[PDB]
Paper text:
The extended family of ATPases related to the yeast Snf2 protein acts to alter DNA-protein interactions. At the heart of all these proteins are paired domains capable of rearranging during the ATP hydrolysis cycle to create a ratchet like motion along DNA in single base increments. The yeast Chd1 protein is a member of this protein family and acts to organise nucleosomes over coding regions. Chd1 enzyme engages nucleosomes in a conformation in which the SANT and SLIDE domains bind linker DNA, while the ATPase domains engage DNA at super helical location (SHL) 2.
As Chd1 binds to one side of the nucleosome, no steric clashes are anticipated should a second Chd1 bind linker DNA on the opposite side of the nucleosome. To investigate this further, complexes consisting of two Chd1 molecules bound to one nucleosome were prepared using nucleosomal DNA with symmetrical linkers of 14 base pairs and the images processed as indicated. Most particles were assigned to 2D classes in which two bound Chd1 molecules are discernible, though one is often more dominant likely as a result of the projections of the dominant orientations observed. All 3D classes have two bound Chd1 molecules and the best refined class provides an envelope with 11 Å resolution (FSC 0.143). Two Chd1 molecules bound in the same mode observed in the 1:1 complex can be docked into this volume. There are no direct contacts between the two Chd1 proteins suggesting that the two bound enzymes are likely to function independently. Our envelope shows that both DNA-binding domains can bind to linker DNA simultaneously and that the extent of DNA unwrapping is similar on both sides of the nucleosome. We do however observe that within some 3D classes the path of the unwrapped DNA is less clear on one side of the nucleosome. This could relate to differences in the dynamic interactions of Chd1 with DNA on the two sides of the nucleosome. Even in the case of a nucleosome bound by two Chd1 molecules the lateral surfaces of the nucleosome are accessible for binding by other factors.
Author numbering:
A (entry chain G): 14 to 118
B (entry chain H): 29 to 121
C (entry chain B): 20 to 102
D (entry chain A): 38 to 134
E (entry chain E): 39 to 135
F (entry chain F): 11 to 102
G (entry chain C): 16 to 118
H (entry chain D): 28 to 122
The structure:
């Protein structure tokens, strides 16, 4: 195979991410399978997030995926929103959640 | 002149997993933003560590720990695995 | 013309709706005024951060792009509109 | 003749309003206000219409979060209505200020 | 010294403030760490200071906690720190859910 | 109901039983509250435990990314830095 | 020579090196090493003295950790700049809450 | 031998400048260097950030100049600039 991505079996851009690691001043020498490793990683994460995003879209009767679909997808999972807890959302919107006691007798 | 996007890379993988499904144009942009932030926190992480013990290299392990720390457990460990396999995949080839 | 009678623009209802979004149930008369003060505090500091870069850039028409980085500084990163 | 029992309307909307994404603040007044202060550092400067929204989102959400902290503390006391101090109490504890 | 009602209550407080010694012992704490530190990894070693440092962090961490707790406590018409008073504080700071 | 070569050895340095309760109240008053609930102080250690792990989690990680057996105090600092509780006085 | 020509108390030919070895931008602007030494000295001086005042407040010959935070914690400004940076052997300001009065 | 360099010479004269026959503990001395090195990265890192936003490739004094302004509150900031601007201004005057 010519395309690097394919030699490592992936969709993520091997060499585009390599250059981005040199135009970001992060250091004097860039590693050889770092780039890939890193590409592949995000790849997973994207997937991870993008795997339920779709499921959320299934949930509400649509075949596409609008941003809230990313938002709910991230908040419910504890191991998802936990990391992004410092991320606020283009028109994120809100989980219906009403505190325990103001609900009525 | 040359507006970059990571839309191309999302575009395939989307279909690979949910082929009867699509992305909002802004939802994709959000994702573009997300990766880069995500690319930087890690890269940032990577760099600091290199420097700490004066390491004129970001190797394939410097990133690995970096992620390990940066990420909450269940997600972190899978990603660690995909990572080594890939090196496994690529070097002999 | 220096913009003033601005602070009010954010009328009774709009402050209130935020709070419902918040998950508050009800609200005393007094705090419509209190929040406006803070809102202002927050805008001031962010716009303060934002404006400098724009000046730094030899320009007036301050960009959305600055709004955001300036937000990233105070520590309110935003996903949605930038770079 | 009929009028809804107190607290029957407010919750109903809470949710309606919780489900949606669309901004609550006004496009015109917001803008004027942003212009008002920006002038006070340097006078008569411009922003792309979106640049204004960028700014509009980051704060609209910001309040709604604080109101949520204000409410817990109202609850903690056996109370029912978010009072003033609670907000301040909240402000002081977060130790932002 | 006046009478006796609530006489020490405020007294000890003051003496404790003027001082700057560790509130919690420096011997139980020392093992507490060694013991859990094993569960996450084996064959562990510790710098003299490293703990000293943790003690500093932790102590300071709690006081701070209590300091708010107190406020909450006051808010409530109470001078009693309570099991929850702890929770709100944390919840709104955000480590606690 | 026998002597039975009985030997008694139980563990009270590290373990939370061992640690001193006044050691806490000592802590409580610096804040200056008038009253301590029995229930409360038990919870408080509870949280201490939660805070303590995460740090060491990281500590351990930095000790180990360098292949070192001796855990540095700096190692703790960065840890604190990551959660935003960085300590002046130490390890520039 | 640096301190001289610049006229500062801080090392101008020391922060220049770290800023180029930290690896901030591509090259380095001539502006900065000098400017960067200056504000630093300015901050250095702003604390020492209030720390001095604090030690004299309670009457002491030598300043020590306890003093430094007492100085800063009380000050409105510094206190915010170092809002969440927490401190060696420091203890705390006297504080008595209101309704906790001994009437 | 070992290195472990610090800013001890700079902090000491500053204190001399503000109470000459006034003293310090060996514990507050490190707090001080810890404090400086901390502010060092805070300012120089931010400079690095702006440089490669609006598309340029070196870090000068102006940037610090800008950086400083929004890193600190109103009253200290102006005096701080002033001091900063002059020190350098004099520096150039000489040469």
């Amino acid at each position: 195979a010519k395309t690097r991505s394919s030699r490592a079996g992936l969709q993520f851009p091997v060499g585009r991410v390599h250059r981005l690691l040199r135009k970001g001043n992060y250091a004097e020498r860039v590693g050889a399978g770092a780039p890939v490793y890193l590409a592949a990683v995000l790849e997973y994460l994207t997937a991870e997030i993008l795997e339920l995003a779709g499921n959320a879209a299934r949930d509400n009767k649509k075949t596409r995926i609008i941003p809230r679909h990313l938002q709910l997808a991230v908040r419910n999972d504890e191991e998802l929103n936990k990391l992004l807890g410092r991320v606020t959302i283009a028109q994120g919107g809100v989980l219906p959640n009403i505190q325990s006691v103001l609900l009525p007798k | 002149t040359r507006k970059e996007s990571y839309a191309i890379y999302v575009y395939k993988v989307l279909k690979q997993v949910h082929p009867d499904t699509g992305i909002s144009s802004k939802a994709m942009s959000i994702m573009n933003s997300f990766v880069n932030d995500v690319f930087e926190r890690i890269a940032g992480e990577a760099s600091r560590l290199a420097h700490y013990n004066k390491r004129s290299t970001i190797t394939s392990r410097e990133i690995q720990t970096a992620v390990r720390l940066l990420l909450p457990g269940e997600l972190a460990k899978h990603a660690v695995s995909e990572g080594t396999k890939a090196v496994t995949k690529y070097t002999s080839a | 013309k220096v913009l003033r009678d601005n602070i009010q623009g954010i009328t009774k209802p709009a402050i209130r709706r935020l709070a419902r979004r918040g998950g508050v149930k009800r609200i005393s008369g007094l705090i419509y005024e209190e929040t406006r003060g803070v809102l202002k505090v927050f805008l001031e500091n962010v716009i303060r951060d934002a404006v400098t870069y724009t000046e730094h850039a030899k320009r007036k028409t301050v960009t959305a792009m600055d709004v955001v980085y300036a937000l990233k500084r105070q520590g309110r990163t935003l996903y949605g509109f930038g770079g | 003749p009929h009028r809804y029992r107190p607290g029957t309307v407010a919750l109903r909307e809470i949710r309606r309003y919780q489900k949606s994404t669309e901004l609550l603040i006004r496009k015109l007044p917001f803008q004027r206000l942003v212009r008002e202060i920006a002038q006070d550092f340097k006078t008569d400067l411009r922003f792309q219409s979106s640049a204004v929204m960028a700014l509009q989102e980051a704060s609209e959400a910001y309040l709604v979060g604080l109101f949520e902290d204000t409410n817990l503390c109202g609850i903690h006391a056996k109370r029912v209505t978010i009072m003033p101090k609670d907000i301040q109490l909240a402000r002081r504890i977060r130790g932002e200020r």
